[PDB]
Design a protein around this ligand. Structure first.
Ligand SMILES: [K+]
Length: 127
């Protein structure tokens, strides 16, 4: 019984920043490992950024390595994606996902590794 709520999307100018949040509700004693995925128009949904239970490991896909940051606040069961230097090509539907098992050696990259998803949040970047 895990529920995820993604928020923080909207319209932003090219060059700007946006922070997305994903809040998990689980009464259990697990700090879920979590991820952001996005689907840009015309493309398959793809992994973007990944964080384990305590934020001791992160992984970024593509230019998120240079521009984006993922973090989490385990005192309020929320993770964040800070996107800086946004470009029109970052216009997409953004999704967060969660799984019970943590990780260290191997990043769980596939969608199938995450049983729990939230509804997407649209980000639109315009010059
Ligand atoms: K990064």
């Amino acid at each position: 019984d895990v529920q995820l709520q993604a928020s923080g999307g909207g319209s932003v100018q090219t060059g700007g920043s946006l922070r997305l949040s994903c809040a998990a509700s689980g009464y259990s004693g697990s700090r879920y490992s979590m991820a952001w995925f996005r689907q840009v128009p015309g493309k398959e949904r793809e992994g973007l950024a990944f964080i384990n239970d305590d934020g001791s490991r992160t992984h970024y896909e593509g230019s998120a390595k240079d521009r984006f940051g993922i973090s989490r606040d385990n005192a309020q069961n929320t993770m964040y994606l800070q996107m800086n230097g946004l470009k029109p090509e970052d216009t997409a539907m953004y999704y967060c996902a969660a799984r019970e098992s943590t990780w260290w050696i191997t990043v769980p990259l596939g969608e199938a590794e995450y049983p729990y998803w939230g509804q997407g949040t649209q980000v639109t970047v315009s010059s």
